[PDB]
């Protein structure tokens, strides 16, 4: 089987800059008919791959001319000039000259944009969940950049590290930001044993964390 080696694994690129993705085949991939079936696909999380370049350098219908493919032998390159926000996702090279057809490991293109602070919102347990006997406190850290971010939970001024579930969205295809959701789960009794709940977001956009809190028995 033809091994398709693709590099780099991750590619952070500034809007407007040029992106260059490499792919090397373990062997010649020129079909007997003289055609090299080397293709490049772009896939957004949760969606099916989309064909961009075929036959090494031909652009599929509807693909912007800033996308360019080149190469021969065992080395191929996909270049994206003037990267735009919508170019995000994972790129895969592919060879269909030899059976079985094989794909490269993929290159995740991350769009670099200006720094942006998160918009933080905290949510106390819903009355319905309390009736159930549980108590989850939710904190949303939305539309920030870069992706590196930290959340710390505090109960009556004291840090709480157990019972936390964090989840990051995939980079936004329009504004290039990220969002993160942090949930602190407790028992209803534990929740009612304290009053002040806090999530603190530490992001490079500020020396001091963005603090959001509430008192359980207050309105």
């Amino acid at each position: 089987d033809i091994l398709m080696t693709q590099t780099p694994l991750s590619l952070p690129v500034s809007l407007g800059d040029q992106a260059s993705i490499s792919c090397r085949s373990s062997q010649n991939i020129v079909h007997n008919n003289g055609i090299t079936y080397l293709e490049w696909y772009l896939q957004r999380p949760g969606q099916s791959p989309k064909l961009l370049i075929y036959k090494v350098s031909d652009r599929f219908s509807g693909v912007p001319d800033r996308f360019s493919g080149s190469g021969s032998g065992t080395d191929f390159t996909l270049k994206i000039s003037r990267v735009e926000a919508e170019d995000l996702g994972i790129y895969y090279c592919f060879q269909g000259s030899h059976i079985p057809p094989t794909f490269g490991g993929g290159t995740k293109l991350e769009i670099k944009r200006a720094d942006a602070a998160p918009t933080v919102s905290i949510f106390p347990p819903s009355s319905e969940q309390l009736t159930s006997g549980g108590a989850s406190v939710v904190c949303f850290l939305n539309n920030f950049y870069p992706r590196d971010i930290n959340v710390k939970w505090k109960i009556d001024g004291s840090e709480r590290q157990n019972g936390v579930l964090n989840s990051w969205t995939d980079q936004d295809s329009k504004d290039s930001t990220y969002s993160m959701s942090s949930t602190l789960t407790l028992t209803k009794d534990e929740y009612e044993r304290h009053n002040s709940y806090t999530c603190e977001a530490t992001h490079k956009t500020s020396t001091s964390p963005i603090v959001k809190s509430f008192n359980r028995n207050e309105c």
Binding site: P49, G106, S121, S136, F140, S179, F214
Partner: protein, 218 residues
């Protein structure tokens, strides 16, 4: 404008088997190879095999030679992929796509997410998340929806039945203690809520459950 129709997801037990469909409408279906591709997470996809509906005929990758069988139903323009002796390593997304002409895979189905597990199906608990009681109104407001303790994936969460899509952030589900949990936030101007209705709709096919939760001030 061809369209490959695939089922969104499916769950199966270890040792069992499944038969996933793909309906090729639009036209042709006879003069085009149909391929099945596997993808775990965001790894490079993996070719399983193909079948030529027109004159029959199939090719399978050695790796799936003994595990997969591709068949077709010309009257319904549908290709099937039979996977047997299912194990946890068969948990992934399976796409059907077509090859033909100067390029391979120009059209794809949405892909079918298959989960192989012996664990039992658990409907999720859906909790509406309104802002902190009595918090100071800002020009915008962020509401939330927490979907906790369900199995298997996936659930389909929408706001106002899909009508409200901008300002939405649905976070990837996370597995903790054998059960999945996910959340979603939606941000709108304070003149939109609570003045107008905003509801979280959660569908969980595995358990045939469809729940709606209105969000109102605490």
């Amino acid at each position: 404008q061809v369209q490959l129709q695939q089922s969104g997801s499916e769950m199966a037990r270890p040792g069992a088997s499944v038969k996933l469909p793909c309906k090729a409408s639009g036209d042709t279906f006879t003069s085009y190879w149909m391929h099945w591709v596997k993808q775990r997470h965001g790894h490079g996809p993996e070719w399983i095999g193909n079948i030529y509906p027109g004159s029959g005929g199939t090719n399978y990758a050695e790796k799936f030679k003994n595990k997969v069988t591709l068949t077709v139903d010309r009257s319904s323009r549908t290709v099937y992929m039979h996977l047997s002796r299912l194990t946890s390593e068969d948990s992934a997304v399976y796409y059907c796509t077509r090859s033909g002409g100067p390029y391979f895979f120009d059209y794809w189905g949405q892909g079918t997410s298959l989960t192989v597990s012996s664990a039992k199906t658990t409907a999720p608990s859906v909790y509406p998340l309104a802002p902190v009681c009595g918090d100071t109104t800002g020009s915008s407001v962020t509401l939330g929806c927490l979907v906790k303790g369900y199995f298997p994936e996936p659930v389909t969460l929408t706001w106002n039945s899909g009508s409200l899509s901008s300002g939405v952030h649905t976070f990837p589900a996370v597995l903790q203690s054998d059960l999945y949990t996910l959340s979603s936030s939606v941000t709108v101007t304070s003149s939109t809520w609570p003045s107008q209705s905003i509801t979280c709709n959660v569908a969980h096919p595995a358990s045939s459950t469809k729940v709606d939760k209105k969000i109102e001030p605490r």
